[PDB]
Homo-oligomer: A and B are copies of this chain.
């Protein structure tokens, strides 16, 4: 009993809200608008600023995490590398945002040694997540070192919550992984953006549901319907098992698809233990006939035993048919909320409208500034002789630009462009190029103003780039929806 500091009412409330919000944000459930944890966001943005894209070969992950420590995220090195390892595995994570280089793990449960042993880089999907970031797309903030700037939320181009899910730590509130097939997800985005009232049955027509990174069988469409209506629910995960009867008589259970985030080795040891716990018999042996390649494993049922009985009993006991809860809890508008499939996609469509409007306004700013400078040079091309007469009558550059701005109503940018205009550009062979490019840039300004004026074309650009992503990446369901 050392500190005896008493008068701590509102200060314990403020410090408690601060430490709770720091838990919820930093080491807990991620955002709606990109589905990415802040550790993950700083991973992607730091590896963007290092430029470690798939044009270059893989770089040492220790340098990337050291730049994360020195710029964006001052926390555990092994925790940042844990996020690195979990992101860069095909079974741990559906679409590997980071493509790694070296031993990371196995489905049996394995870990890499440290951040200085293996390499990594961004995959083809992180370039999607970071395409059009540097263009006033999402507002930056100053981080803990007050010299670096980080993005608040990564400007996504595909809604990554439905793709990769949110694993959650409860300090009262935890959250789950509904994974999804990318192409059906994008089609669901299209149908929601077309009709503002689509029933969730008509999106279950679109979306089957859990597209696992290793495949499985999903039992229960009722729990699926409950989940994409209310947010809370549970489905059942039955492995892809089949009964194959030999001509000899000793039947066969071929198991090929253990469910989401379930060990192989622990389940097979649990099966052998349940043989030697002797509650039920009939299992002859287990053949684990692969080292790393191909997931198809034979467990034998003896002669004179219907293997569907053994199959139902291993589904009852083991981690081969489990429950799996859905609770789609994430940050919207700064608060954690349980949100539905409708609400996730409504918010994502609103965010892509924000992304498109900000990118379009940025390019209109850039082209408008260039057209402003080119208009100043065009006014210089209008009355060349008066400009030359003032330059010959000038004494300093400031006098020349001030008298040009006084005489032809010019800007500082315009007058600097005139006083830095090259004399070789004083020809009709150059006035043609300037005038044609000026009309082209005003045409581009009119096009971007038409984009900013009509929200239909906003949705059109969204549809086009989403279908581009769907062409570039969309596989189909490794998991079969059974009944």
CA distance A23 to B16 in the complex (A): 12
Q: A146-B322, A336-B11 are in contact. Are A16 and B6 (CB under 8 A)?
A: no
**A20 vs B2: C-alpha distance when bound (angstroms):** 12
Smallest beta-carbon distance A155→chain B, Å: 18
Query: CB distance B146 to A5 under 8 Å?
Result: no
**A390 beta carbon closer than 8 Å to chain B:** no
Does A4 sit within 8 A of B, measured CB to CB? yes
Find out whether the CB atom of B173 lies under 8 angstroms from the CB atom of A336: no
Contacts of A6 in B (CB 8 A): 21, 334-335
**How many angstroms from the CA of A241 to the CA of B133 in the assembled complex?**
36
Question: Contact size class for A?
Answer: 35 or more
Given the contacts A16-B172, A170-B15, A172-B16, A21 and B8 also touching, CB distance less than 8 Å: yes
User: A18 and B172: CB pair below 8 A?
Assistant: yes
Taking a contact as CB atoms under 8 Å apart, the answer to whether B319 and A15 are in contact is no
Q: Are B11 and A331 in contact (CB under 8 A)?
A: no
Residue of B with least CB distance to A26? B2
Do A16 and B146 touch (CB < 8 A)? no
Q: By CB atoms of chain B within 10 A, which of A5, A15, A20, A319 has the most?
A: A5
B12 near A25 with CB under 8 A, answer: no
Q: Assess whether A171 is in contact with B21, with CB atoms less than 8 Å apart.
A: no
A384 within 8 A of B: no
Flag whether A350 is at the interface (Cβ < 8 A): no
Report which residue of A3, A23, A266 has the largest number of chain B beta carbons within 10 angstroms of its beta carbon: A3
Question: A25 and B7: CB pair below 8 A?
Answer: no
- Any B CB within 8 A of the CB of A38: yes
Chain A, range 1-59, C-beta contacts under 8 Å to B:
1-8, 11-12, 14-26, 38
The B-contacting residues of A in range 307-364, CB under 8 angstroms, are 317-319, 322-323, 331, 334-336
- Asked if A144 is at the interface (CB within 8 A of a chain B CB), the reply is yes
Report 5 cross-chain contacts, Cβ distance below 8 Å, ordered by A residue.
A1-B144, A3-B21, A11-B336, A15-B170, A147-B319
Q: Which 10 A-B pairs have the closest CB atoms?
A: A3-B25, A15-B172, A7-B335, A15-B171, A18-B172, A14-B172, A6-B334, A2-B38, A12-B20, A2-B26
